Design an enzyme around this catalytic site. Structure first.
Site, PDB file in Angstrom:
ATOM      1  N   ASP A   1       0.815  -1.216   0.000  1.00  0.00           N
ATOM      2  CA  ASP A   1       0.000   0.000   0.000  1.00  0.00           C
ATOM      3  C   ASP A   1       0.853   1.273   0.000  1.00  0.00           C
ATOM      4  O   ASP A   1       0.484   2.283   0.608  1.00  0.00           O
ATOM      5  CB  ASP A   1      -0.958   0.004   1.201  1.00  0.00           C
ATOM      6  CG  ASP A   1      -1.921  -1.178   1.201  1.00  0.00           C
ATOM      7  OD1 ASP A   1      -2.259  -1.696   0.113  1.00  0.00           O
ATOM      8  OD2 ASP A   1      -2.352  -1.584   2.302  1.00  0.00           O
ATOM      9  N   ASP A   5       2.774   2.201   8.004  1.00  0.00           N
ATOM     10  CA  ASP A   5       1.716   1.242   7.636  1.00  0.00           C
ATOM     11  C   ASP A   5       2.199  -0.040   6.947  1.00  0.00           C
ATOM     12  O   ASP A   5       1.396  -0.777   6.364  1.00  0.00           O
ATOM     13  CB  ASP A   5       0.594   1.918   6.832  1.00  0.00           C
ATOM     14  CG  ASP A   5      -0.223   2.891   7.665  1.00  0.00           C
ATOM     15  OD1 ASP A   5      -1.147   3.515   7.100  1.00  0.00           O
ATOM     16  OD2 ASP A   5       0.049   3.034   8.879  1.00  0.00           O
ATOM     17  N   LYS A  59       2.160   4.704  -0.883  1.00  0.00           N
ATOM     18  CA  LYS A  59       1.581   5.916  -1.459  1.00  0.00           C
ATOM     19  C   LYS A  59       2.077   7.140  -0.670  1.00  0.00           C
ATOM     20  O   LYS A  59       2.579   6.982   0.445  1.00  0.00           O
ATOM     21  CB  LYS A  59       0.046   5.832  -1.476  1.00  0.00           C
ATOM     22  CG  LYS A  59      -0.620   5.730  -0.111  1.00  0.00           C
ATOM     23  CD  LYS A  59      -2.136   5.778  -0.247  1.00  0.00           C
ATOM     24  CE  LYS A  59      -2.761   4.404  -0.118  1.00  0.00           C
ATOM     25  NZ  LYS A  59      -2.996   4.069   1.317  1.00  0.00           N
ATOM     26  N   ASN A  69       1.421   7.496   2.971  1.00  0.00           N
ATOM     27  CA  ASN A  69       2.179   6.594   3.841  1.00  0.00           C
ATOM     28  C   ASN A  69       3.665   6.937   3.940  1.00  0.00           C
ATOM     29  O   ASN A  69       4.449   6.183   4.521  1.00  0.00           O
ATOM     30  CB  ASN A  69       2.016   5.142   3.374  1.00  0.00           C
ATOM     31  CG  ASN A  69       0.640   4.590   3.655  1.00  0.00           C
ATOM     32  OD1 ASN A  69      -0.075   5.077   4.535  1.00  0.00           O
ATOM     33  ND2 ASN A  69       0.258   3.563   2.911  1.00  0.00           N
ATOM     34  N   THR A 115      -6.230   4.699  -3.757  1.00  0.00           N
ATOM     35  CA  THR A 115      -5.233   3.631  -3.660  1.00  0.00           C
ATOM     36  C   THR A 115      -5.045   2.902  -4.998  1.00  0.00           C
ATOM     37  O   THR A 115      -4.059   2.184  -5.190  1.00  0.00           O
ATOM     38  CB  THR A 115      -5.565   2.629  -2.518  1.00  0.00           C
ATOM     39  OG1 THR A 115      -4.439   1.773  -2.281  1.00  0.00           O
ATOM     40  CG2 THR A 115      -6.788   1.778  -2.856  1.00  0.00           C
TER      41      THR A 115
END
Length: 258
Positions: A125, A145, A127, A130, A157
């Protein structure tokens, strides 16, 4: 939950992140994850085992995890402090980044990703949301995360997801793809696979086709385009690793002051 820590301010919104003081007197960033907001993908004994590993992780570009609490309502992740917000904020502010500043950021993102992959941790995940800034300066980028995708969408996402994740057959190479999408965005100010809705974004991702279109890409260096191409190669087996990306000429060039 409320006895141990004193709230100073909200930092972000898995759930909410608060800046808290220990009632030790050190400042911490605490992520509150609501049980109802997430769908569990593992058993009760698998998360606690991963937490034991996540607490051991020690890297300049990775958020340190100190504590993990539970009650009938929430998960509590006590991390180190960060005061510079997210990379997502800087993208709104700057719109596009210079190649020197992008390489400085990406070197850190790739350093942290490389370290995670060395311990069989895939983020999945990755991005700008994050990617956290330590302070308002020089400030270190720290990945957050990680290790959560193995246990638990409208937050854009779809932009960063690797095509293999959609085919339900992925490994660590999906993080390199996500990093490539982030890099693309840093260089021009827009995603390589766009669209008004998540459905039309995911179809462009599945197709895998992207362009370096004028006038935004015209003055971008050749080695920057070369790296984006390597990170956004459709075949994950043919896709370069995080370590290879970290060692790429473009990173080496612009991080040694060129």
């Amino acid at each position: 939950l409320s006895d141990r820590y004193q709230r100073v301010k909200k930092l972000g919104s898995y759930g909410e992140v608060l800046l808290c003081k220990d009632k030790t007197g050190a400042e911490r960033a605490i992520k509150i994850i609501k049980k109802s907001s997430v769908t569990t993908t593992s058993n009760s004994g698998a998360l606690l085992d991963e937490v034991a590993v996540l607490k051991q992780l020690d890297h300049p570009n990775i958020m340190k995890l100190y504590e993990f609490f539970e009650d009938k309502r929430n998960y509590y992740l006590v991390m180190e402090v960060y005061r510079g917000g997210e990379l997502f904020d800087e993208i709104i502010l700057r719109q596009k980044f210079s190649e020197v500043d992008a390489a400085v950021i990406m070197k850190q993102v790739l350093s942290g990703t490389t370290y995670l992959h060395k311990h069989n941790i895939v983020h999945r995940d990755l991005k700008p949301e994050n990617l956290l800034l330590e302070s308002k300066s020089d400030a270190l980028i720290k990945i957050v995360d990680f290790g959560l995708s193995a246990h638990f969408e409208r937050l854009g996402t779809a932009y960063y997801i690797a095509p293999e994740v959609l085919r339900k057959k992925y490994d660590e190479k999906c993080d390199v793809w996500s990093c490539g999408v982030i890099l693309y965005i840093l260089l021009c100010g827009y995603p390589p696979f766009g669209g008004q809705t998540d459905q039309e974004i995911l179809k462009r991702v599945e197709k895998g086709k992207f362009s370096f279109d004028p006038p935004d890409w015209t003055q971008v260096s050749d080695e920057a385009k070369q790296l984006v191409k390597l990170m956004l190669t459709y075949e994950p087996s043919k896709r370069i690793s995080a370590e290879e990306a970290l060692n790429h000429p473009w990173i080496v060039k612009f991080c040694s002051q060129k």
